[PDB]
Amino acid sequence: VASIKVIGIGGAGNNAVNRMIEAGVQGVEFIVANTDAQIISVSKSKNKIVLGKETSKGLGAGANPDVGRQAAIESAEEIKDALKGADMVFVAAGMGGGTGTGAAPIIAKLAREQGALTVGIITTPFSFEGRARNSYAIQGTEELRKHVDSLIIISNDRLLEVDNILRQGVQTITDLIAVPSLINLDFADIKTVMKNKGNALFGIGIGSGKDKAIEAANKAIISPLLEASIRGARDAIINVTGGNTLTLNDANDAVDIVKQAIGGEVNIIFGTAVNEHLDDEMIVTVIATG
Amino acid sequence: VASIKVIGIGGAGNNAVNRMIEAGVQGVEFIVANTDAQIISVSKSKNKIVLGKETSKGLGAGANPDVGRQAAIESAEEIKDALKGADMVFVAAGMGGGTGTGAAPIIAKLAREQGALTVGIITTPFSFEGRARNSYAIQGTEELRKHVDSLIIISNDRLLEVIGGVPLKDSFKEADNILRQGVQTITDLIAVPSLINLDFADIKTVMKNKGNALFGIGIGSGKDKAIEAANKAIISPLLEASIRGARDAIINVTGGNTLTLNDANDAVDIVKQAIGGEVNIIFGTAVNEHLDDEMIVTVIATGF
Ligand SMILES: Nc1nc2c(ncn2[C@@H]2O[C@H](COP(=O)(O)OP(=O)(O)NP(=O)(O)O)[C@@H](O)[C@H]2O)c(=O)[nH]1
Ligand SMILES: Nc1nc2c(ncn2[C@@H]2O[C@H](COP(=O)(O)OP(=O)(O)O)[C@@H](O)[C@H]2O)c(=O)[nH]1
């Protein structure tokens, strides 16, 4: 009977191990390791290791893989004790953060030096977690690969198919001023809406198919991006984006809902733009202030 | 014709400006600023600023907002010069790091004092980025709000809900599940008795001293479930490369109580033909009684 252990490292690895326990994976011993004692405390695993107990003190490593690496080196003897006797060790982690990225290669090396067949199984971060976390992931992936027998890499980007939001926010306002289309706005109109206003709420929704203008406009009003409710906003800007087939009739049908949803005396302005990638699809974007 | 400038600060802002240029946003001038001179040199932007060229020496701020703030102050003249004449300035940054958090409010202050309508548009961190980063982010946000006309705040938590289509609490449920399947694909074959198990020594032959192991999963149902499941596994989006030409592979065939030997046999033959050559294939089976007229084929391929 092979002795099989899974050690889940960092937040992602800790949650993966919880999933394995709740799915009833059999024949396997589960261990979780983290520098963050809070995640460890809600673990379903019976074998818990707080990495770097003396230096990080269970408070977490933060963003920097060097701290997760040093935490695992400090805990080397506890890790060897937990893994001792394994014929096979899976090292589970999400690349991108301070703990999984830096600790997983150390733990792989210790497991393999004990004689276990050592399999790394990791995720890599979304593109939109940004270049710094993706760059850490790349370096931690290479360091782990050095120390595991085999490495399985699961891309969170690709796992979706089984994109930049700061761009969408800017273009929502600028196309209405700088790109002439069916309807456009003056810069002085944007200024009355946005000058000396504080918080501005951003919502986006998209409608596929004919009644799109009602669908998109309705998703926008409740977009999770909305920091608060748009109800009662003194002023608001609406951007109705579409394809070559976009019409002025549909535009006011989208805007009508938003004017309804805000109600009151809302100084509401709007405008249009077209997109060479959308056929019948039509996305509504709202910015409201007050 | 209004003068509109976007200044992207730090990693997230630089990234955002690159994507605006590539998407061909029109009617806008773009500027990038970073303490990191390396990230800047790659930028496609025509207007570049290395913040704090003396105090930071071209090296990033290292998660410390104090360094972003001081590098921006030191570069105030270059910032004024790039923004001069704007009717509207968008200040774009990601809160929580060293550069964006500290530099964005200084840049907004400068832009607004020059006369621009000044709009901050920022992300705030994913909750999994931890406590110190989410706390820096909130300070940075409150400082930025003092120096902009308006502030659009995009939570990266909410952005992940919007992109994945599920509540935050479930945002990584599929990833957790794939990691569980990656383990279970192999461990069931070794440790859970079924009609077809594999010996640990044979797993070792496939996985020891290998490097990258390709992983694919497919599910199928109905009369042609094996053809459907196996072909989905071999072009699975999870695979980091083609399995064509692998030297060894493990195949897990999991089905319900109605799975036939013929189904399991067809799936193994499809994977062998897809890989090709003289691939050493080993395979085993597993029962999951919650499957109803479905089967799941998983492949782990090594050796390139
Ligand atoms: N949606 C989104 N968020 C990003 C992106 N890039 C970075 N971020 C977010 O912005 C936060 C700050 O990242 P970043 O801009 O690289 O910080 P910095 O200040 O430039 N780098 P440093 O800390 O090394 O000085 C990140 O913690 C993350 O939450 C991105 O492309 N998209
Ligand atoms: N499978 C899974 N992945 C996660 C989860 N949370 C975050 N991630 C991904 O894993 C990467 C690292 O997150 P985490 O493990 O919490 O970082 P760390 O503990 O600080 O090292 C992130 O960059 C995300 O891409 C989760 O709960 N489950």
XYZ file of C-alpha atoms in Angstrom, chain A residues 2 4 6 12-13 15-16 19-20 23-28 30 62-63 87-88 90 92-94 112 115 117-119 121-123 126-131 133 141 145 148-156 158-171 173-175 177-179 187 190-191 193-202 204 223-227 287 289, chain B residues 2 4 6 11-13 15-17 19-20 23 25-28 87-88 90 92-94 112 117-119 121-123 126 128-129 133 145 148-156 158-164 171-184 186-188 190-192 200 203-204 206-215 217 236-240 300 302:
182
model
C 1.575 3.267 -1.191
C 0.282 9.185 -0.451
C -1.026 16.035 -0.459
C -5.100 28.471 -2.903
C -3.478 25.202 -1.766
C -8.669 25.738 -0.246
C -7.837 22.994 -2.769
C -12.138 20.706 -1.622
C -10.370 17.320 -1.716
C -15.152 15.583 -2.164
C -14.153 12.484 -0.220
C -10.829 11.807 -1.963
C -9.682 8.459 -0.541
C -6.362 6.808 0.218
C -4.558 10.091 0.819
C -3.836 15.816 3.727
C 2.351 39.398 2.225
C 3.092 39.754 -1.476
C 5.877 7.184 -1.217
C 4.268 10.045 -3.195
C 1.581 16.192 -4.257
C -0.499 21.973 -4.374
C -0.381 25.782 -4.624
C -1.481 28.873 -6.527
C 11.924 14.621 -2.970
C 12.665 9.819 -1.428
C 7.847 10.793 -5.923
C 6.990 14.505 -5.896
C 4.305 15.964 -8.158
C 0.188 20.797 -9.226
C -0.277 24.577 -9.408
C -2.402 27.336 -10.868
C -5.337 35.653 -14.151
C -3.824 38.085 -16.641
C -5.753 40.853 -14.830
C -4.010 40.200 -11.521
C -1.341 42.243 -13.255
C 2.237 41.930 -14.386
C 1.964 38.794 -9.682
C 6.964 27.960 -11.551
C 9.907 22.682 -11.777
C 9.475 18.259 -8.576
C 9.520 15.022 -10.574
C 6.564 16.223 -12.724
C 4.770 19.608 -12.806
C 1.133 20.126 -13.766
C 0.221 23.755 -14.526
C -3.405 24.881 -14.677
C -3.991 28.366 -16.146
C -6.767 30.410 -14.544
C -7.755 29.170 -19.816
C -9.869 27.618 -17.084
C -12.452 30.289 -17.866
C -12.936 29.036 -21.433
C -14.001 25.678 -19.970
C -9.691 42.485 -21.152
C -8.731 45.681 -19.291
C -11.119 47.540 -17.010
C -9.220 50.822 -16.640
C -9.419 51.079 -20.451
C -13.198 50.575 -20.489
C -13.670 53.269 -17.829
C -11.707 55.915 -19.743
C -13.104 55.123 -23.203
C -16.255 59.081 -21.454
C -13.736 59.909 -24.193
C -15.526 58.325 -27.175
C -16.195 63.639 -26.832
C -13.460 62.673 -29.290
C -15.024 60.062 -31.588
C -16.611 68.580 -23.102
C -18.854 66.124 -19.052
C -17.428 68.889 -16.873
C -21.226 66.090 -14.411
C -17.716 65.442 -13.069
C -16.207 68.710 -11.803
C -15.838 68.753 -7.994
C -17.986 65.659 -7.425
C -16.039 63.059 -5.411
C -17.174 59.457 -5.902
C -18.344 58.399 -9.365
C -20.126 55.074 -9.785
C -19.235 52.801 -12.700
C -21.516 48.053 -17.235
C -23.445 45.574 -12.264
C -21.393 44.371 -9.255
C -18.874 47.085 -10.160
C -21.380 49.630 -8.831
C -19.852 50.823 -5.572
C -21.068 56.766 -14.728
C -22.151 61.279 -9.553
C -10.764 69.099 -26.068
C -7.568 64.701 -23.114
C -4.443 59.635 -19.638
C 2.206 48.493 -13.153
C -1.578 48.625 -13.436
C -1.607 52.074 -15.067
C -0.617 48.070 -18.409
C -3.869 50.004 -18.906
C -2.236 52.549 -21.221
C -4.002 48.250 -23.825
C -5.581 51.575 -24.826
C -7.116 48.914 -28.931
C -8.546 54.507 -28.515
C -8.829 57.806 -30.357
C -8.632 61.445 -29.373
C -6.417 60.911 -26.324
C -8.612 70.098 -20.545
C -9.124 66.681 -18.891
C -7.384 60.726 -16.276
C -5.045 55.658 -13.829
C -3.387 53.403 -11.227
C -3.790 50.279 -9.107
C -5.639 69.693 -11.091
C -10.670 68.443 -14.987
C -9.000 65.565 -13.120
C -10.611 62.107 -12.938
C -9.767 55.807 -12.174
C -8.290 53.105 -9.952
C -8.566 49.463 -8.990
C -8.343 41.361 -4.588
C -6.612 37.346 -1.539
C -3.830 39.955 -1.843
C -2.029 45.604 0.690
C -9.896 61.589 -3.348
C -9.342 64.714 -8.024
C -12.585 66.178 -9.304
C -14.020 62.679 -9.363
C -12.819 59.197 -8.532
C -13.994 56.014 -10.243
C -13.152 53.035 -8.016
C -13.115 49.515 -9.481
C -12.850 46.745 -6.858
C -10.827 43.878 -8.215
C -16.121 42.874 -8.094
C -14.231 42.744 -11.351
C -13.596 39.050 -10.820
C -17.308 38.475 -10.183
C -18.103 40.342 -13.401
C -15.563 38.389 -15.487
C -16.199 34.915 -14.030
C -14.670 32.641 -7.847
C -12.075 29.869 -7.375
C -14.473 26.907 -6.966
C -13.639 25.516 -10.425
C -9.921 25.964 -9.884
C -10.097 24.183 -6.491
C -12.063 21.412 -8.221
C -9.501 20.976 -11.057
C -6.676 20.726 -8.493
C -8.713 18.060 -6.678
C -9.205 16.198 -9.982
C -5.507 16.450 -10.823
C -4.634 14.588 -7.611
C -7.588 12.170 -7.705
C -3.766 9.519 -10.153
C -4.548 8.603 -6.536
C -7.796 6.726 -7.275
C -3.317 3.613 -7.058
C -5.279 3.584 -3.839
C -8.995 2.968 -4.542
C 2.855 2.760 -7.866
C 3.074 5.674 -12.044
C 6.717 6.385 -11.145
C 5.485 7.885 -16.138
C 6.186 10.743 -13.690
C 9.721 10.502 -12.261
C 12.357 12.979 -13.523
C 9.960 14.316 -16.200
C 9.499 18.093 -15.908
C 6.171 19.309 -17.365
C 3.172 16.959 -17.300
C 0.260 17.886 -19.584
C -3.202 17.571 -18.068
C -10.067 16.444 -18.935
C -8.693 20.493 -23.447
C -8.003 24.220 -22.858
C -6.175 23.080 -19.700
C -3.346 21.565 -21.766
C -0.343 23.864 -21.882
C -1.594 13.117 -17.884
C 4.845 13.455 -20.049
